[PDB]
Amino acid sequence: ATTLNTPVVIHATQLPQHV
Amino acid sequence: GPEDFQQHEQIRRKTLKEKAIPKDQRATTPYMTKYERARILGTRALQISMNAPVFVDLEGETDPLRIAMKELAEKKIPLVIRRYLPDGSFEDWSVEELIVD
Amino acid sequence: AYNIAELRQAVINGPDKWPGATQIQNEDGSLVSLIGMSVEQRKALANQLLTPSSNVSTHTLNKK
Amino acid sequence: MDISKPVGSEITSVDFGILTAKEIRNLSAKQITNPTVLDNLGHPVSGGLYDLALGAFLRNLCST
Amino acid sequence: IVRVPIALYVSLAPMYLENPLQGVMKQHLNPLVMKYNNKVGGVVLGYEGLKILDADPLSKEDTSEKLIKITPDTPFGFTWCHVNLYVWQP
Amino acid sequence: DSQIWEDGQGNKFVGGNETTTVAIPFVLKYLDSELSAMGIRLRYNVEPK
Amino acid sequence: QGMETSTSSFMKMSYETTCQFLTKAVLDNEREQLDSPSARIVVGKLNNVGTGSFDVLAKVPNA
DNA sequence: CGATAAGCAGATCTCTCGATTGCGTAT
DNA sequence: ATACGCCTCTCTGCTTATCG
RNA sequence: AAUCGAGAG
Numbered sequence: 001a002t003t004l005n006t007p008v009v010i011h012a013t014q015l016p017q018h019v
Numbered sequence: 020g021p022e023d024f025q026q027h028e029q030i031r032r033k034t035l036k037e038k039a040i041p042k043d044q045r046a047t048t049p050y051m052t053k054y055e056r057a058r059i060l061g062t063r064a065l066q067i068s069m070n071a072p073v074f075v076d077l078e079g080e081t082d083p084l085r086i087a088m089k090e091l092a093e094k095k096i097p098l099v100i101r102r103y104l105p106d107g108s109f110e111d112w113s114v115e116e117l118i119v120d
Numbered sequence: 121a122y123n124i125a126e127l128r129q130a131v132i133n134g135p136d137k138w139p140g141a142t143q144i145q146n147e148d149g150s151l152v153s154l155i156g157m158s159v160e161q162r163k164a165l166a167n168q169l170l171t172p173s174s175n176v177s178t179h180t181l182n183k184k
Numbered sequence: 185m186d187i188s189k190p191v192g193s194e195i196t197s198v199d200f201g202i203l204t205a206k207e208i209r210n211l212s213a214k215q216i217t218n219p220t221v222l223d224n225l226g227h228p229v230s231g232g233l234y235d236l237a238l239g240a241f242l243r244n245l246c247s248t
Numbered sequence: 249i250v251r252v253p254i255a256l257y258v259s260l261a262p263m264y265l266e267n268p269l270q271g272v273m274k275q276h277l278n279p280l281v282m283k284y285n286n287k288v289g290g291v292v293l294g295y296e297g298l299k300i301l302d303a304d305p306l307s308k309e310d311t312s313e314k315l316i317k318i319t320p321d322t323p324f325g326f327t328w329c330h331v332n333l334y335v336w337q338p
Numbered sequence: 339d340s341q342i343w344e345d346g347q348g349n350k351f352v353g354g355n356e357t358t359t360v361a362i363p364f365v366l367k368y369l370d371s372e373l374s375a376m377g378i379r380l381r382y383n384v385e386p387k
Numbered sequence: 388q389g390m391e392t393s394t395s396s397f398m399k400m401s402y403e404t405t406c407q408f409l410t411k412a413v414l415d416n417e418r419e420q421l422d423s424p425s426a427r428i429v430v431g432k433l434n435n436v437g438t439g440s441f442d443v444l445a446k447v448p449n450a
Numbered sequence: 451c452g453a454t455a456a457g458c459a460g461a462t463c464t465c466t467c468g469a470t471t472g473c474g475t476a477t
Numbered sequence: 478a479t480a481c482g483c484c485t486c487t488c489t490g491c492t493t494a495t496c497g
Numbered sequence: 498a499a500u501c502g503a504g505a506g
């Protein structure tokens with residue numbers, strides 16, 4: 001749980017597209 | 020939802036691209052300032068101390084700052100200085116593009 | 121790999137014989153103090169100084 | 185400062201403002217009523233200034 | 249089984265300064281596999297198409313040499329990245 | 339089930355998990371408390387949002 | 388009195404009459420951008436003068 | 451409105467020691 | 478023995494007044 | 498923690 005093994009912030013670019 | 024983030028990211032990238040000064044018209048000193056030299060040496064020394072790859076022949080040396088000074092002498096430091104103008108606009112000079120002293 | 125020659129000697133010398141070392145900071149932030157240890161303990165710690173990290177979360181780090 | 189514990193965020197700027205009474209009650213952990221801090225036997229009193237909801241106090245686990 | 253393109257802010261160790269793609273993978277993406285992530289929606293099957301957002305906006309995206317922003321008080325570099333995550337959630 | 343958290347008192351909450359970590363002094367935190375005692379709030383804007 | 392019209396309130400608050408400069412900062416909802424050396428020392432940011440006048444980027448080889 | 455006679459406010463390096471810190475009272 | 482409430486020698490600048 | 502007193506540059 002550190003800035004060396006997990007991303008700082010995560011955001012969604014678009015809506016989830018089903019494949 | 021996410022599209023709010025997409026708009027914010029687009030705006031951030033657009034403002035960043037507007038602030039950047041293209042290489043063809045940067046009007047700052049060709050020489051590396053003493054402050055830039057000191058910080059390049061310190062940051063490169065930190066990176067070497069944290070087990071980064073090194074681009075010079077270690078003459079049996081152990082001081083990371085000395086290794087960084089050797090890299091600067093041989094112009095092998097993969098760093099870039101981003102000089103900031105008062106308005107927030109910035110230029111980008113590579114280390115090998117600058118002349119020390 | 122370029123520091124172990126003299127950092128190992130500092131750890132062996134310990135907190136009293138200059139040049140020496142007072143602490144070892146592990147990859148996971150542990151602070152092993154050499155103040156109350158004996159010569160053989162310090163020698164074992166100095167020999168296990170540059171050991172490859174087993175934890176994935178700290179493979180980017182080395183002891184201090 | 186440990187150079188092996190990088191921080192991702194950074195305080196860009198700060199803005200001054202008024203702490204409104206609604207948000208003060210919204211974020212709070214306990215209301216302080218009785219003007220006694222410690223009872224006999226040296227223990228905090230519930231609702232007092234040294235309430236365990238305001239933080240740990242002399243080997244007492246914080247209740248928040 | 250849904251593709252969720254995401255953008256993340258991830259640190260980069262000085263040891264992976266020659267292959268930042270592998271650095272980002274082994275630092276943030278591999279420990280994001282077979283875990284329920286609170287953001288994407290569900291467990292993550294895998295990832296593909298990692299891209300590093302260059303810190304200099306002028307350079308065209310064609311180039312493979314990019315810039316990473318180094319923390320002032322640390323040799324770790326932080327950068328925005330784009331990647332498409334394969335997810336599963338009810 | 340993800341954004342629900344508990345206190346020691348058991349009061350369940352569902353809310354702000356958008357919290358990060360910064361590198362500040364500690365007298366800054368004490369100044370924040372002394373300002374809150376004055377009824378003054380300080381908002382700190384973090385770089386990455 | 389000769390420094391009242393300044394953009395950074397932390398500088399004046401550190402200087403003197405901390406109460407008055409804080410009241411005027413909060414009444415106007417002043418948002419100082421942490422630029423004066425005093426403000427960064429209050430908040431714990433690398434200064435802007437000298438070796439803080441620029442930033443440092445790493446030229447990573449592979450995209 | 452205004453021009454003083456007047457009133458009020460906040461100012462005017464670092465470091466080492468020791469000694470003392472509150473009196474009357476009602477039950 | 479003791480537990481609640483009681484204890485006269487500098488300076489500039491901002492601000493209000495007040496009286497013909 | 499203050500206050501007083503003694504010092505050092």
